[PDB]
């Protein structure tokens, strides 16, 4: 229904996995919230202290 | 109080920046997926 | 066919690693770069 491990990933279908490949290829690596918070923190540190 | 309001202003600006980055990334991925799906 | 494709994908895919492995590999890399 959602995910059966990499041991089984052919069960879904060929158009299925093909669109899967193209969306992974066209979408960047998945990042978490901590990455965005750290990026904002780096930005406000790079703005310099008044 | 002045220090506190400055701190919250900075925090809010940071949150807007994070949300803008996420929204831009999502919209770029969505448009590019649109082009790809249109191709197939 | 189900279990046969299962066997072939296990054979052709390496052992499953967790996130800690990748973090440790990055840590080893930045330790091997040497201290400036």
Numbering used by the authors:
A (entry chain A): 252 to 301
B (entry chain H): 202 to 241
C (entry chain B): 266 to 301
Task: Show passages lifted from the paper.
The enterobacterial common antigen (ECA) is a carbohydrate polymer that is associated with the cell envelope in the Enterobacteriaceae. ECA contains a repeating trisaccharide which is polymerized by WzyE, a member of the Wzy membrane protein polymerase superfamily. WzyE activity is regulated by a membrane protein polysaccharide co-polymerase, WzzE. Wzz proteins consist of two transmembrane helices flanking a large periplasmic domain; there is no cytoplasmic domain.
The 3.6 Å cryo-EM structure of full length WzzEPA that is found as an octamer with a large enclosed central periplasmic lumen connected to a membrane cavity defined by the transmembrane helices. The reconstructed 3D map shows only WzzEPA and that WzzEPA forms an octamer made up of four dimers arranged in C4 symmetry. A prominent conserved feature of the Wzz monomer is a long (approx. 100 Å) helix, which is approximately parallel to the long axis of the molecule. This helix is connected by a helical turn-containing loop (residues 241–265) to two shorter α-helices, which are arranged approximately anti-parallel to the long helix. In the octamer, there are slight structural differences between the monomers localized at the loop that connects the long helix to the two shorter α-helices and this resulted in C4 symmetry. These helices connect to a region of structure identified as motif 1, which is formed by residues 58–204 and 310–317. In WzzEPA, motif 1 consists of a β-sheet with four anti-parallel β-strands and four α-helices. Two regions within motif 1, a loop (residues 153–163) (L-loop) and a loop–helix–loop (78–100), point into the large central periplasmic lumen. The transmembrane helices, which are not closely packed, enclose the disc-shaped cavity within the membrane resembling that seen for other Wzz structures. The location of the antibody indicated that WzyEPA is positioned in the centre of the transmembrane cavity formed by the transmembrane helices of octameric WzzEPA.
